[PDB]
Design a binder for this molecule. Sequence first.
Ligand SMILES: *[C@@H]1O[C@H](CO)[C@@H](O)[C@H](O)[C@H]1NC(C)=O
Lengths: 129, 132, 111, 51
Amino acid sequence: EVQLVESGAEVKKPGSSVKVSCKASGDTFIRYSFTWVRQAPGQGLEWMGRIITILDVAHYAPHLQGRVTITADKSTSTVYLELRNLRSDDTAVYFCAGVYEGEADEGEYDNNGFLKHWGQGTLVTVSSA
Amino acid sequence: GIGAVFLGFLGAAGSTMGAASMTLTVQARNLLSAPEAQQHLLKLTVWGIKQLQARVLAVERYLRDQQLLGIWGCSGKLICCTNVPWNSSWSNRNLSEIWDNMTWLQWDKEISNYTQIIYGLLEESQNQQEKN
Amino acid sequence: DIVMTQSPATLSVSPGERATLSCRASESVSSDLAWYQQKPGQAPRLLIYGASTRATGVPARFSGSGSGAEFTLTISSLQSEDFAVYYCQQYNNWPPRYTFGQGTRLEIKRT
Amino acid sequence: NCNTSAITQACPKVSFEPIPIHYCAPAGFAILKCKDKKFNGTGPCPSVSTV
Ligand SMILES: *[C@@H]1O[C@H](CO)[C@@H](O)[C@H](O)[C@H]1NC(C)=O
């Protein structure tokens, strides 16, 4: 039972890099898979991808791969994300989701595909206004 | 596949040198020797190929031997003697101390280090019979 | 992608009627769909996973399921606290490069 | 300790069960047996046969 807290908005032109943190705390971090998804207000949604932390291996989006980084620090058991080469039209609210996975330290790992929980909100004003 | 005859050459171990030679020269006369479906037209030949690579390798081995004997004056024979006298620097022993109380592998371990030199001596002594 | 022909596209609806969203597919999609909800100016909240039964640990008036591509989210009695969007998501493909959707945007009675 | 590499590919579930597969000796060699019924780990097998 781990919490999900997120961050706010930053102004940069397309091309910059910004660090964002769904800082997850509260209980055992290992038993859960984590994923991200964003949506700009009034348009479709952009799902980021899952990070299977116990192996510390993630994935991404086909037409976003090349300028993204998601990291799950098992040591501090936190989460970081570094975004690069942005684009102006992408001012979107963000969310970090997760699902209870199972006894990884015991090997059992279902590896489902839905998104149990939901984040709070994070904006990327890709602009200088 | 004639490559089975080789087995016979080992089917008389223990039997000492004299008896081994007798049984060898007499083995010379005694050892004298479907719904094929769609898939079963290309995974099948690739078996035959693997079997024809045996018999051919057998006769190739054989023929390679008989040639080697050609260097040693005799070929197509089984019991072969030639024109060199044995040196004494080679594991001096009584003639009867071997031909009645020894097996061949004993010989192997006996002069395994002389095989090459007697080989070569054989290989040359024939050339004398060319110039003479 | 899974052709989320969300029917109806947007629905200005009242409390207390059988909800039937149709966001079907184009390829073989066996048993993997997902419906979530988000309130105007609020966070999203999960409704249905499993693609065959109700979600677990959730208030289970809903029954989001159906036949393959024709999966309907079923809240027979809408309320004053469901003036919020509804979503369709799929998580099939392997090699793992998953997908997402856009969902449907429900609204209150508008004049 | 050093770099790794995830390898994401297809993994359909598939039958799996062993069968007998026996090694043979190429033309020119032989396979020696230990027909003794008391073969301690090493030591002269007092009856050997060729196959
Ligand atoms: C096998 O035999 C060897 C020598 O005969 C002996 O040293 C060894 O202890 C034996 N191993 C056993 C009996 O497990």
